């Protein structure tokens, strides 16, 4: 899509370390399946690291310094996360990107992410950096309207997408995860999305 940059296998050499750091983050702020304000439990399990974390609070979504499950700050952003995000963001031409939030998604087979926009960040000029690890997933994206036609791209282990420019506000999602196996993740896919969430 216009504005979006795909860097295939950009995070391949870093994957092992990133996965260790995911485990470390989740040991402090555990993965949970958040409940939408619609009352549905998501198939995707989530957690956050960094100064701010995306979560549900009082039947709604927000960036918060505190993990509502633990009542403690989200774990600090791992070095591996920060390094890889910056190498990706710079390669795609976003030198001033300074992320302070990393949402971590975990997909078991069957798990999917419904069509949505990321429009909750203060500056929409800032991109989102997205890192795929483990099992491959079909990423779908449309446009500015919920009913716009979808295009599909397979995202694989180590792929990084820098989601900026025109595509920044496009609706997008993930199709039900095909069952499979990966040496590093076992039977799941992880996705990291780095954001400038602070005002
Ligand atoms: O790949 C996922 O599991 C979900 N990714 C996203 O929701 C996303 N959002 C904004 C920009 C890039 C993304 O990959
Ligand atoms: Fe998204």
Curated annotation (Swiss-Prot):
Keywords: Dioxygenase, DNA damage, DNA repair, Iron, Metal-binding, Oxidoreductase. Its EC number is 1.14.11.33. One of its GO terms (biological process) is RNA repair. The keyword Transmembrane does not apply. 2-oxoglutarate binds at residues 105-107, 189-195. Fe cation binds at residues 116, 118, 172. Residues 98-198 form the Fe2OG dioxygenase domain. It is an enzyme of class 1 (oxidoreductase). One of its GO terms (molecular function) is broad specificity oxidative DNA demethylase activity. Dioxygenase that repairs alkylated DNA and RNA containing 3-methylcytosine or 1-methyladenine by oxidative demethylation. Has highest activity towards 3-methylcytosine. Has lower activity towards alkylated DNA containing ethenoadenine, and no detectable activity towards 1-methylguanine or 3-methylthymine. Accepts double-stranded and single-stranded substrates. Requires molecular oxygen, alpha-ketoglutarate and iron. Provides extensive resistance to alkylating agents such as MMS and DMS (SN2 agents), but not to MMNG and MNU (SN1 agents). This is Alpha-ketoglutarate-dependent dioxygenase AlkB. It comes from Escherichia coli (strain K12).
